[PDB]
């Protein structure tokens, strides 16, 4: 629902990634103060998520890559690819 | 740093390439870079008349009646509507003769404009509806100022955006 | 920008090739702000946080110009002596202010003839120039005379 | 420059509203203004705040009398206590007959409490009257004016006093010597101490406050990586706040931390303000002293308080980075300097702008108020520098040299003088009417000036520069008031180098000191 | 590359930090890769693609990098300055009075529901 | 720290499963105030703490500075959201002087949320679930691997 | 060739005048006040002029 959401961002049984403090930096670059805990978790919350789902596009757009039936980089093929498919812009770095 | 640059330059064998660079570009009757001229050439109306040397097909001659008439059209924002096929067909063809073509515009032509611009204004007011309710209420200026402030790629900058930064008055007035 | 060449380029980067990292940046301390003094009176101190004469070997086009015992001690670089700083009119400025003070022949008027003086030198603007003058001059009216309580008088009114 | 004129007197040969006679004097914007003078509160009173479209200094006078005495000597005190009651019953009965008799409650109410020990039925005896046929009908009064009141002083006392009542005669010095001669004299004494006070203007007074070379105090900002833009300090000379370059604004309070909000809550000196986008690049603090401002490049102007340190208020007019916001000499009105090629005029209740300025082919680098407050002075990257009228929107004047940009500028209090400060490293001193530069301060090295300012009367200014150094500049070596006082260019009086720091701005005190601030330590 | 460098020195900018030469120079292929991109397309347009019709050969004259520089200009690239627009634009906000009032001596705010009242944020 | 602890084991499963991937091909084939440059680099931590997908910071180091810069670039997106609407100076929003917020304090957030990326708040407890099962899939995946591996080098 | 620069004494560039103020102030209830200005306009209200 919603509010099981800010039932549970409270307590210790659901502490994103990204630490508080960094998020508090975050927030007051960008103008934002406030005593409550809640809203900067849930902001680190869903940051955390986009950043997963441009990890699976990179996971799967790498599967796709050879053999699809020395280990794995995720190089700028890949990330030219998946950063394209959002609406992240074109990366046409060279050489010379 | 500055000798030594220079002289690395010309440890490359482009230092013939960079001698020769000095002269003014633009071999042509000119290309201005000024802005007065520039804003008046892009103001006034132009006239596509032609010459003739042996022949100069086309079977329709050339005319700017065509370009006042386009400039007088009761345009948009005037009116509370968006225009309907006649006046937006009689404002092309002042353009078109303005830039320097000629023959009339086809009709199929004003369809497509219509249908493509009914697109844009459902896409703008479908975030501004966006904005105001998450799931009785009435719109406002300011929330589509907002979202012109989000979403900008939206409209293209120039001529309404400072417009619209000039039009945000206060209650009393 | 490592060099390449082929059958030159001047291009490649050779800078990957990480597999986990777990460095820990280093916090630096807050901005906070050093007061010092500097240029009392026109002179610099070297003593303090300041520069030594040696923009001599600075990039002459870069900073250029240059112009500039006891408890009795009122400033020695600051050369007080010559008596060409002061003005022209400052000097008369002063006899008049000195004269009009150093009165002292009724009980009447003549209070009414410096107090004006007085209370004008109270309130009134660029006086930082001949402040020392002062110092000295009324320094030796109270090593001169010792009886008149007009005098002493005068002078706490006027350090008021 | 020969084709200026050929080309300007061919085009005004064309305007049929210019004949050939008042062609010439419009050719007459090469002499400058007379030496005018500085408005002392002697004569000139003062004036409301108001706008730039065109009663109570009896309060004000009586204000001068419960001040200067507090602030006197202790052996004045037992004197000066029975100096107070009487003069201020006076200045009522006066204001309430004078025909403001809600005025003469009110302060009446607000200075019942000045002598309650004394007289405990005097307050009753005047609480019971409001109207003015409730004055002539009450008796007391009237025999108090009938006959005067013994007044026990010595002779010098009342001397240097009547000789502080002289100097301010602008929100009330007169009407209470006034009062004095006609109700005690403990205004013929009055003329004739008038007539003592010319006579100290004859070679008393100081005539012509020559040059005075200043003292310095500098606060150099160590451990910032170079993420500071703006400095600026407080009018009183108790703060410095800075802006950085992520969105902060740290205040510092110089002598102490009474940094403290005056709620219960909110438990040193140093104090973050947030509520910001992008960086900050101008920032300014009201001349009461209880509220601040500050710009920056995500086209926000926010309001702050200074007794909870708390924003109250956002604006948005503009369409791109604001440089730098200034307030008004007085309050009520702040301007704004952008990146759109404009300048917006606020207000501080109204929350979207009043007037828009457009004349600028780039940016507009910088914005400031003539000491009138009804002009403003931007200066920009097209290396011209603008005047603008804040009701009517447009340019009256335009001066334009100045081979690259400009940063900074400043006003002398008088009202002749602007200064132009650039990438160039060349000060220019502007005359407003004549628009030509009348002096051009040639030093500097070749670097950025940043800031700079003039004195408390005119008589000097000081550039402040990107060249590691601060340059105090006489100013009246060849101006209208030559001011010489004799024994790269002159009008050049000393230049005081730091430990390889820029410096940023100034600000004069009320007193001869400078207060200086800079970065970089060593 | 050290002709960037040659080009710094045309405004007087001897300090840079080795980074933006890198930067910019990426930063000129990317636009020109997308301009002389769009070019080949108009180019393409003047052979009259669709599901097959024709070839595709290339000659790419100035005319079709102009047409690809001209609409890219037409959202970017801060144009001349539009003063004219500006001045009549100024002109109509220029147009209605001051206030003409006294706050005697304050501040006045706006009033409280435009004023923000910065508490700490709550649900 | 439940979140920072499970993808801490989810870290932990993939460090030894693709160990033992990788020694499996060999034996086949046999045969406060805080500044800025510490929150950037905790971010990166965190990042390269995300990326279960490929290998923690088994990348080149221009991805790493991209990324960090694209979430930061979104976070602020969030907040510059959250703040226009709270200042907004229009009717819709903008306490009524009889206290009726037309849209409460909540709706703000919720809004905020669903202008940028995520669409409903449920989703959130979508993706929360979708990870702890992703654990729990990989892990059996290659445990299955790694079983039939056992076998296989028999 | 007609411009009016000329100053005035505000009680900001001189001393011993400083006026008193009572708008910013403490009550002992309440935590602070200030001076803000009055509209007409209230909350749910007709929003503007017809559509036409």
């Given at each position: 629902t919603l509010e099981e959401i800010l039932e549970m961002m409270e307590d210790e049984e659901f502490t994103p990634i990204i630490p508080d403090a960094v998020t508090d930096y975050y927030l007051a670059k960008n103008g934002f103060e406030t005593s409550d805990i809640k809203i900067k978790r849930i902001l680190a919350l869903a940051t955390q998520k986009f950043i997963s789902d441009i990890a699976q596009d990179a996971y799967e757009y790498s599967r796709i890559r050879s053999s699809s039936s020395n280990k794995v980089v995720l190089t700028m093929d890949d990330l030219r690819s998946a950063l394209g498919e959002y609406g992240i812009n074109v990366k046409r770095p060279n050489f010379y | 740093y500055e000798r030594l640059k220079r002289d690395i330059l010309a440890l490359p064998v482009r230092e013939r390439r960079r001698i020769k660079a000095i002269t003014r570009e633009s071999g042509k009757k000119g290309m201005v870079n000024s802005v007065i001229t520039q804003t008046r050439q892009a103001l006034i109306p132009k006239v596509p008349v032609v010459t003739r040397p042996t022949n100069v097909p086309g079977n329709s001659v050339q005319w700017a009646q065509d370009v006042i008439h386009g400039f007088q059209a009761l345009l948009a924002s005037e009116i509370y509507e968006l225009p309907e096929m006649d006046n937006l067909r009689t404002r092309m063809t002042g353009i078109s003769r303005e830039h320097g073509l000629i023959g009339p515009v086809d009709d199929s032509v004003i369809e497509i404009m219509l249908i493509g611009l009914e697109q844009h204004l459902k896409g703008i007011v479908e975030a501004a509806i966006d904005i105001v309710k998450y799931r009785r209420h009435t719109l406002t200026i300011e929330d589509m100022y907002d979202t012109l402030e989000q979403y900008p790629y939206l409209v293209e900058p120039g001529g309404t955006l400072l417009r619209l930064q000039s039009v945000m008055l206060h209650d009393e007035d | 920008f490592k060099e390449a060449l082929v059958g030159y380029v001047d291009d490649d980067e050779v800078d990957f090739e990480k597999l986990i990292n777990e460095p820990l940046p280093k916090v630096p301390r807050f901005s906070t702000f050093t007061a010092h003094w500097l240029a009392i009176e026109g002179v610099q101190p070297a003593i303090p946080q300041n520069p030594s004469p040696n923009d001599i070997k600075n990039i002459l086009p870069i900073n250029r110009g240059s112009m500039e015992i006891s408890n009795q001690k009122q400033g020695l670089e600051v050369k007080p002596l010559v008596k060409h700083v002061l003005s022209r009119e400052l000097q008369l400025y002063f006899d008049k202010i000195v004269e009009v003070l150093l009165n002292?022949?009724?009980?009447?008027?003549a209070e009414l003839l410096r107090n004006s003086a007085l209370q004008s030198v109270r309130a009134d603007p660029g006086l930082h120039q001949l402040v020392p003058y002062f110092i000295q001059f009324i320094s030796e009216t109270i090593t001169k005379n010792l009886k008149n309580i007009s005098l002493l008088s005068t002078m706490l009114e006027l350090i008021y | 420059a020969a084709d200026l004129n050929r080309i300007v007197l061919e085009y005004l040969n064309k305007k049929g509203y210019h004949k050939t006679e008042s062609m010439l004097r419009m050719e007459s914007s090469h002499i400058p203004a007379p030496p005018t003078n500085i408005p002392t509160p002697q004569t000139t009173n003062i004036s409301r705040p108001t706008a730039p479209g065109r009663p109570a200094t009896i309060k004000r006078g009586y204000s001068i009398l419960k001040s200067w005495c507090e602030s006197?000597?202790?052996?004045?005190?037992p004197e000066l206590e029975k100096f107070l009651y009487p003069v201020f019953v006076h200045c009522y009965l006066d204001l309430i007959a004078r025909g403001y008799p809600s005025h003469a409650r009110e302060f009446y109410d607000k200075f019942s409490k000045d002598h309650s020990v004394l007289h405990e039925y005097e307050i009753s005896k005047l609480g019971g009257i409001s109207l003015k046929e409730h004055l002539q009908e009450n008796d007391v009064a009237k025999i108090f004016r009938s006959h005067k009141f013994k007044v026990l002083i010595g002779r010098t006392t009342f001397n240097l006093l009547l000789y502080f009542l002289n100097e301010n005669d602008?929100?009330?010095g007169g009407v209470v010597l006034r009062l004095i001669n006609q109700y005690i004299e403990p205004a013929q004494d009055l003329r004739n101490d008038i007539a003592m006070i010319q006579d100290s203007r004859a070679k008393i007074k100081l005539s012509a406050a020559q040059a005075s070379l200043p003292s310095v105090c500098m606060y150099t900002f160590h451990n910032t990586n170079n993420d500071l833009t703006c400095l600026k300090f407080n009018d009183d000379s108790t703060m410095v706040a800075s802006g950085f370059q992520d969105s902060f604004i740290k205040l510092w309070s110089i002598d102490g931390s009474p940094l403290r909000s005056l709620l219960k809550n909110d438990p040193k000196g140093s104090r973050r303000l947030v509520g910001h986008s992008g960086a900050v690049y101008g920032v300014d603090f009201s001349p009461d002293n209880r509220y601040l401002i500050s710009c920056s490049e995500d086209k926000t102007v926010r309001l702050w308080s200074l007794d909870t340190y708390t924003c109250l208020v956002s604006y948005k007019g503009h369409s791109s980075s604001v440089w730098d916001v200034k307030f008004s000499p007085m309050g009520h009105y702040f301007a704004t300097a952008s990146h759109d090629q404009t300048a917006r005029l606020w207000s501080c209740d109204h929350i979207y702008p009043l007037r828009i300025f457009a004349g600028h082919l780039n940016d507009v680098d910088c914005v400031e108020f003539h000491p009138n407050s009804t002009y403003l002075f931007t200066g920009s990257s097209d290396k011209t520098a603008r005047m603008w009228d804040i009701a009517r929107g447009e340019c009256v004047r335009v001066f334009m040299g100045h081979s690259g940009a400009i940063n900074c500028l400043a006003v002398s209090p008088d009202g002749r003088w602007l200064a132009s400060a650039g990438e160039d490293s060349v000060v220019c001193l502007w005359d407003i009417s004549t628009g030509r530069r009348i002096k051009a301060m040639r030093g500097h090295g070749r670097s950025s000036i940043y800031s700079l300012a003039f004195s408390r009367e005119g008589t000097v200014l000081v550039s402040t520069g990107a060249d590691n150094s601060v340059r105090v500049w006489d100013v009246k070596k060849n101006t209208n008031s030559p001011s010489a006082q004799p024994e790269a260019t002159n009008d050049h009086m000393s230049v005081y180098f730091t430990k390889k720091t820029p410096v940023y701005t100034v600000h004069f005190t009320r007193r001869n000191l400078c207060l200086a601030g800079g970065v970089f330590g060593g | 590359v050290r002709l960037l460098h040659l080009i710094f020195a045309t405004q007087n900018i001897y300090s840079y930090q080795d980074h933006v030469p890198l930067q910019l120079m990426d930063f000129a292929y990317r636009y020109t890769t997308g301009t002389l991109q769009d070019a080949t397309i108009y180019s393409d347009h003047a052979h009259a693609s669709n599901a097959g019709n024709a070839g595709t050969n290339a000659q790419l004259t100035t005319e079709d990098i102009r047409l690809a520089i001209a609409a890219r200009t037409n959202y970017q690239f801060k144009p001349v300055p539009p003063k004219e627009l500006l001045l009549e634009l100024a002109a109509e906000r220029n147009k209605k009075p001051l206030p003409a009032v006294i706050p005697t001596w304050g501040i006045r705010l706006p009033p409280e529901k435009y004023c923000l009242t910065g508490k700490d944020w709550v649900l | 720290g439940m979140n920072k602890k499970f993808n801490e084991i989810i870290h932990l499963m993939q460090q030894i499963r693709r160990i033992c991937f990788k020694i499996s091909l060999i034996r086949q084939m046999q045969t406060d105030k805080l500044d800025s440059d510490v929150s950037y680099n905790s971010l990166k931590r965190s990042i390269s703490k995300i990326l279960m997908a490929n290998g923690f910071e088994s990348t080149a180091p221009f991805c790493s500075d991209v990324i960090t810069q694209i979430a930061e670039n979104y976070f602020g997106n969030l907040v510059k959201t959250l703040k226009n609407h709270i200042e907004s100076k229009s009717i819709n929003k903008v306490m009524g002087d009889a206290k009726f917020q037309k849209v409460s304090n909540k709706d703000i957030l919720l809004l905020s949320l669903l202008e940028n990326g995520v669409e409903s708040p449920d989703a959130l407890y979508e993706y929360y679930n979708e990870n702890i099962v992703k654990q729990i899939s990989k892990l059996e995946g290659l445990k299955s691997r790694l079983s039939s591996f056992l076998a296989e080098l028999l | 060739n007609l411009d009016l620069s000329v100053p005035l004494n505000p009680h900001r560039a001189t001393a011993n005048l400083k006026p008193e103020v009572k708008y910013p102030y403490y009550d002992p209830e309440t935590d602070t006040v200030v001076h803000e200005h009055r509209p007409d306009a209230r909350g749910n209200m007709v929003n503007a002029d017809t559509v036409d």
């Open positions: - | - | 002292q022949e009724e009980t009447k008027e | 006197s000597l202790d052996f004045y005190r602008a929100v009330g | - | - | -």
